[PDB]
Nucleic acid binder design. Structure first.
Ligand SMILES: [Cl-]
Ligand SMILES: [Cl-]
Ligand SMILES: [Cl-]
Ligand SMILES: [Mg+2]
Ligand SMILES: [Mg+2]
Ligand SMILES: [Mg+2]
Ligand SMILES: [Mg+2]
Ligand SMILES: [Mg+2]
Ligand SMILES: [Mg+2]
Ligand SMILES: [Mg+2]
Ligand SMILES: [Mg+2]
Ligand SMILES: [Mg+2]
Ligand SMILES: [Mg+2]
Ligand SMILES: [Mg+2]
Ligand SMILES: [Mg+2]
Ligand code: NA
Ligand code: NA
Ligand code: NA
Ligand code: NA
Ligand code: NA
Ligand code: NA
Ligand code: NA
Ligand code: NA
Ligand code: NA
Ligand code: NA
Ligand code: NA
Ligand code: NA
Ligand code: NA
Ligand code: NA
Ligand code: NA
Ligand code: NA
Ligand code: NA
Ligand code: NA
Ligand code: NA
Ligand SMILES: [Sr+2]
Ligand SMILES: [Sr+2]
Ligand SMILES: [Sr+2]
Ligand SMILES: [Sr+2]
Ligand SMILES: [Sr+2]
Ligand SMILES: [Sr+2]
Ligand SMILES: [Sr+2]
Ligand SMILES: [Sr+2]
Ligand SMILES: [Sr+2]
Ligand SMILES: [Sr+2]
Ligand SMILES: [Sr+2]
Ligand SMILES: [Sr+2]
Ligand SMILES: [Sr+2]
Ligand SMILES: [Sr+2]
Ligand SMILES: [Sr+2]
Ligand SMILES: [Sr+2]
Ligand SMILES: [Sr+2]
Ligand SMILES: [Sr+2]
Lengths: 115, 145, 119, 246
RNA sequence: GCAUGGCAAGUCUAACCGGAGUAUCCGGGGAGGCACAGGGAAACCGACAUGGCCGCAGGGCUUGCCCGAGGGCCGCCGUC
RNA sequence: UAUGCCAGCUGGUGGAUUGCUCGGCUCAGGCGCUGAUGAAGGACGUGCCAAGCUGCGAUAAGCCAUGGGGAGCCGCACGGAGGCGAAGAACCAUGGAUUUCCGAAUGAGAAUCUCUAACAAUUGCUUCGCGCAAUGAGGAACCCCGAGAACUGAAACAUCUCAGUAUCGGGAGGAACAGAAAACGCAAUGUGAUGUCGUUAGUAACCGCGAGUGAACGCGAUACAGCCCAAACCGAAGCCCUCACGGGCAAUGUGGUGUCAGGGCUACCUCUCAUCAGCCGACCGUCUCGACGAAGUCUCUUGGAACAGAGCGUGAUACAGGGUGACAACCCCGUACUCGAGACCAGUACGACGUGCGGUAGUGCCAGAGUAGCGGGGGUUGGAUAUCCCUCGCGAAUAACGCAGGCAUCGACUGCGAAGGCUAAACACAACCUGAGACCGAUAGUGAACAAGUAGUGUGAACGAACGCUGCAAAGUACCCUCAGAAGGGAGGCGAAAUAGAGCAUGAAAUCAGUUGGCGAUCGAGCGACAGGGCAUACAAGGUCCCUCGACGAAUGAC
């Protein structure tokens, strides 16, 4: 019953990648996005900074918000970022869409889920 | 299809016996009726408690935690960068319609700050000084004695 | 207005002086050129050609013009009663075309020939 | 991307940067939500007379004469909903709020998204518009505004292989139902939307199915009649640029 | 409460003002509301951007061993 | 096979259904008082023939003038007869004439009539004479001032609630009311008349501290506008009526001055554009009305009819809507553009005339009394000690004084001058005009699409229905036969259709007549479901079915 066409496509793509590559994360993330919006992740930077490590793609099965301070040089992959979130992240690292991540790493390797 | 849309043909529309949905008796009385008898459950108990001071003899302090200030230092570039110096009064929203500004010590202070405010909490200082910082009590702030 | 009820109502209840416009008919090619108008108010003197009913193709002199019912009788455009008598079959001017005008009236002629106004 | 500019003769006359908004991802759900609200917001409040069926002292006789306890007057049943000439139980009410709210951000996002749907020939074609062109939207020199005669705009559209859509809209439908009794006998296909910058195009507005608008206030309904994205549009050199900051 | 959607440490404008294609709609309007600190009748004081241990999902590895968001059990902090 | 059961067929009855809309309903904008110069309303008249409606008033569906309009007309209302109109009628706009009786109803009286010149009655002025004037009654609601319930909620009920609601008495206007601080009290080095809208807020406050009730300051908006007396000091310098003469008012004070940027007086400086009064007098905008206004009525076919299909063509600042024998931009009205008039904004804004702002020093000259305030008793309010008002009693100061700032007193501090008065705009309503609609579509929507507040009920107050549709055109059935017959019937005529022939588009069910199939005068009652036999069946929209034998052959399973 999702209404957003892009969110549906993302979920479709997330499943294709998980069924055709060495990655159970994508399908896992697909399962969480299929759940009601209220359960989706809403994470501020402060949390990414605390549990992320470099060269390990941070994957947010939701949206990234701008509260807190991120210093680590990490790549954050999420369904969406607030304007400030994407800004603070691009400064010390990189902000990428779950659509790009699925394309650069269909095997979904070396990645940590954060909520 | 909604629940409402499926009731035609049901006769009772989910009410159970057709003898149920009548007047207020089906609710035990109108409004908060029985809040001390049949429906006392979960209701706050009866009684008076405390008092209130007149609203014009009341002070509303504008507060802020160091955590807020500290996490936004570099962004608050539009404010002193000495050996940062920051007049909290120029930072807090609602500071205008408030009787004074107070710095609270929630969180950390990863920089050396010179904070200027009408008042600070014990922990607010300890942390600020602790990070090789200072605390400056405004003129109004000079109301502690 | 745009509402159908009000449009028909304004037409059925229009005062007499406003009913002349309900008996107007288009003019022949020549007449339009001659008086610089596309149509005119059919008079009991004009000659007209029927272009639509069962009498389409016939031409005749207008013998009567009823403003109360907004219809006209044209010579020879009739119906035969049960007894045999021949009565006129009323026509809507909208189905007719004026091929010859009766200008016996100076006011009408002056009106037609003028530019600012039309007859 | 870049969009080709055309002169009143239909000949190419340079080209400009197609503003970024036309890159906004097409969102039919948001667009539909936006059109739904504009359509609801112009609906008028209505409802039956609040005392209808109530102007009677009708009383019930109660038990005794072998009749159901129904209020009667002059031997006639009245007032109650089951009675002919009685009140309406749960009728249309004037106090009802028939408007729909919509956050400004959410509405603006839909406008940008409807704009972006205009630059996709495949969509525009899916929506239904007829044309033999490849590039869309159609951009024209600001001189377009100085036109005055409708047939002039006709020539230009034919020269642009876009007039076919006006032929599509040159068919009215006499609707089924009683809308006719209320002034809604006809309806017709939506054709070309002309977006200028100074004033709507008086010369183009009477074209079958055509809609005229201005870059500063062109809305979601203009761009997506009925909430269906991808309307065959024609902008003005300036309109194109001004529409960029919406 | 819930489902969906926008924006997010913020979010939303209300009356109302200008424009216009003139009840729609485009722009403006943050007054004010709720959220961003609590505790205490009040005076008044004023907090974990993480210290420990389990461990689901997921990730890693040399395939039992690591990392382990969320969660669980504690510490500790504000106030009466 | 009679009486009869079930189903259908032809024809009725009935008026569902579908389609249609001259009526409703709701919203929006505009506009907004009438009456003794007799209103609103009612009665009775008024037509060639005239019952109802509409109009009108003994000049009676109308009279006159100006402008518009135009060859027709004599309302609804489709008759007959007759008449009017180029001496420019009808019709429309504006203005005028006529305008019976009752009615506030006013000479007295009275169920719409009568009896012997009349502002009846209450007032003001007064020439003391009804001489000059006012009031009275109406209006959909809105508005202001008074009187003020109960059902109900609290699951009973008394305070509380419903509610200052319903209803009653009085009164004004186009809007009312309010309104230039004895204010506010984000307490301030701050705001600055008043409504109203949003918010403040279900906050403060109330309350068998139960149920419930419930603001304000402030802020953001809308619109903005400030003034006049009493007194001091002057003291007839004045006002009203009359053409005038003249009369009346006025020392118990007309008039000048003045009004918290306090004022006055004495002495000065300077100066007015403040204010008050009067004159002139719009733009624009909005609402309504009006004028003008492009382009096909071409071919073929179907049809009763082209507004259909196919072919060719055209306008568009006009492709809103309607009409016209069927789906119409181009046949007619309109519609876009442009233009004109009236109304409202508004006797307002601007402009101009006059007046003259303000400042210094001195001066205890002036500045609203049953008041401010207190007490007894009530009501009311969120107002709690701290709301507003009524009532009984008591009762002050004089600016060097007094009031307020949410208990009292005193001091300080801040604010402000009560006991006189006026005041535009922004806001309420919807009678009236116009526009609009995801509203209803004749058992709906108004009670009312029709004779509608009709017919009808009740002594009265009051109550109160139902009734929409011939057709393209009345071509609304001539002649003949029958009959007691303008009835009805038969035959006939018209039309595409009379199974469109008068509550006359369609024409369901219940149900009735006739009739077809099946059953039926020895047999049993939830009327059927599922199986299987009889008999019945035009086409179309379903085309399968049966028997020998053979193949396959689950559980089961022999002689
Ligand atoms: Cl977080
Ligand atoms: Cl308190
Ligand atoms: Cl203030
Ligand atoms: Mg002419
Ligand atoms: Mg009804
Ligand atoms: Mg239908
Ligand atoms: Mg009398
Ligand atoms: Mg009770
Ligand atoms: Mg008021
Ligand atoms: Mg109780
Ligand atoms: Mg109350
Ligand atoms: Mg207050
Ligand atoms: Mg009370
Ligand atoms: Mg009815
Ligand atoms: Mg019939
Ligand atoms: Na029930
Ligand atoms: Na009634
Ligand atoms: Na409403
Ligand atoms: Na705000
Ligand atoms: Na009016
Ligand atoms: Na009559
Ligand atoms: Na008269
Ligand atoms: Na009088
Ligand atoms: Na007298
Ligand atoms: Na009770
Ligand atoms: Na009782
Ligand atoms: Na109480
Ligand atoms: Na403020
Ligand atoms: Na015609
Ligand atoms: Na009160
Ligand atoms: Na008292
Ligand atoms: Na005060
Ligand atoms: Na009916
Ligand atoms: Na059978
Ligand atoms: Sr239920
Ligand atoms: Sr009941
Ligand atoms: Sr209850
Ligand atoms: Sr108890
Ligand atoms: Sr604020
Ligand atoms: Sr007539
Ligand atoms: Sr007539
Ligand atoms: Sr009994
Ligand atoms: Sr906003
Ligand atoms: Sr934890
Ligand atoms: Sr003001
Ligand atoms: Sr005074
Ligand atoms: Sr005090
Ligand atoms: Sr009926
Ligand atoms: Sr009604
Ligand atoms: Sr009786
Ligand atoms: Sr016959
Ligand atoms: Sr076998």
């Amino acid at each position: 019953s999702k209404t957003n066409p892009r969110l549906s496509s993302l979920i479709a793509d997330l499943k294709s990648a998980a069924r055709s590559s060495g990655g159970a994360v994508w399908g896992d993330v697909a399962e969480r996005l299929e759940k009601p919006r209220r359960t989706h992740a809403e994470v501020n930077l402060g949390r990414i900074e605390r549990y992320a490590q470099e060269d390990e793609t941070v994957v947010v099965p939701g949206k990234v918000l701008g509260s807190g301070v991120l210093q680590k040089d990490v790549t954050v992959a999420a369904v969406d970022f607030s304007g400030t979130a994407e800004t603070k992240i691009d400064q010390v690292g990189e902000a990428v869409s779950l659509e790009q991540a699925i394309e650069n790493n269909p095997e979904g390797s070396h990645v940590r889920v954060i909520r | 299809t909604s629940k409402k849309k499926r009731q035609r043909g049901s006769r009772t529309h989910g009410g159970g016996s057709h003898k149920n949905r009548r007047g207020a008796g089906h609710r035990g009385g109108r409004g908060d009726a029985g809040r001390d008898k049949h429906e006392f459950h979960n209701h706050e108990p009866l009684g008076k408690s405390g008092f209130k001071r007149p609203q014009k003899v009341q002070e509303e302090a504008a507060t802020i935690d160091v955590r807020e200030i500290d996490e936004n230092v570099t962004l608050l570039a539009a404010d002193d960068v000495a050996e940062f110096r920051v007049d909290v009064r120029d930072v807090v929203e609602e500071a205008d319609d408030a009787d004074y500004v107070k710095v609270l010590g929630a969180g950390q202070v990863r920089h050396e700050l010179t904070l200027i405010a009408d008042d600070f909490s014990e922990g607010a200082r300890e942390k600020v000084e602790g990070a090789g910082g200072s605390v400056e009590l405004t003129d109004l702030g000079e109301e502690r004695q | 207005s745009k509402q159908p009820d009000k449009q028909r109502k304004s037409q059925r209840r229009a005062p007499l002086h406003e009913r002349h416009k309900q008996v107007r008919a288009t003019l022949s090619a020549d007449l339009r050129e001659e008086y610089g108008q596309r149509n005119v108010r059919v008079n009991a003197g004009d000659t007209v050609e029927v272009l639509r009913g069962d009498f389409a193709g016939e031409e005749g002199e207008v013998i009567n013009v009823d403003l109360d019912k907004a219809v006209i009788h044209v010579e020879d455009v009739t119906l035969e009663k049960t007894d045999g008598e021949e009565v006129p079959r009323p026509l809507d001017t909208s189905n007719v075309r004026v091929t010859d005008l009766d200008l016996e009236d100076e006011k009408r002629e002056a009106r037609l020939e003028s530019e600012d106004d039309s007859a | 991307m870049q969009a080709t500019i055309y002169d009143l003769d239909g000949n190419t006359d340079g080209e400009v940067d197609l503003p970024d908004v036309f890159e906004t991802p097409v969102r039919s759900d948001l667009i539909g939500k936006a059109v739904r609200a504009a359509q609801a917001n112009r609906k008028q409040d209505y409802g039956s007379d609040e005392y209808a069926g109530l102007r009677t002292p009708a009383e019930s006789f109660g038990s005794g004469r072998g009749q159901a306890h129904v209020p009667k007057l002059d031997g006639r049943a009245r007032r109650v909903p089951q009675a002919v000439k009685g009140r309406s139980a749960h009728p249309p009410k004037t106090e009802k709020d028939r408007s729909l709210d919509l956050n400004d951000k959410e509405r603006q996002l839909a406008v940008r998204s409807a704009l972006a749907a205009t630059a996709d020939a495949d969509l525009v074609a899916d929506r239904g518009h007829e044309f033999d062109r490849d590039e869309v939207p159609v951009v024209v020199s600001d001189d377009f505004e100085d036109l005055v005669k409708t047939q002039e705009v006709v020539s230009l559209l034919e020269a642009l292989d876009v007039h076919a859509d006006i032929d599509r809209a040159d068919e009215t439908k006499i609707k089924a139902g009683q809308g006719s009794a209320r002034g809604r006998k006809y309806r017709r296909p939506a054709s070309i939307l002309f977006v200028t910058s100074d004033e709507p195009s008086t010369a183009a507005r009477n074209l079958a199915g055509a809609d005229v608008a201005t870059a500063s206030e062109v809305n979601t309904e203009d761009l997506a009649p009925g909430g269906a994205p991808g309307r065959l549009t024609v902008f003005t050199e300036s309109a194109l640029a001004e529409v960029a900051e919406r």
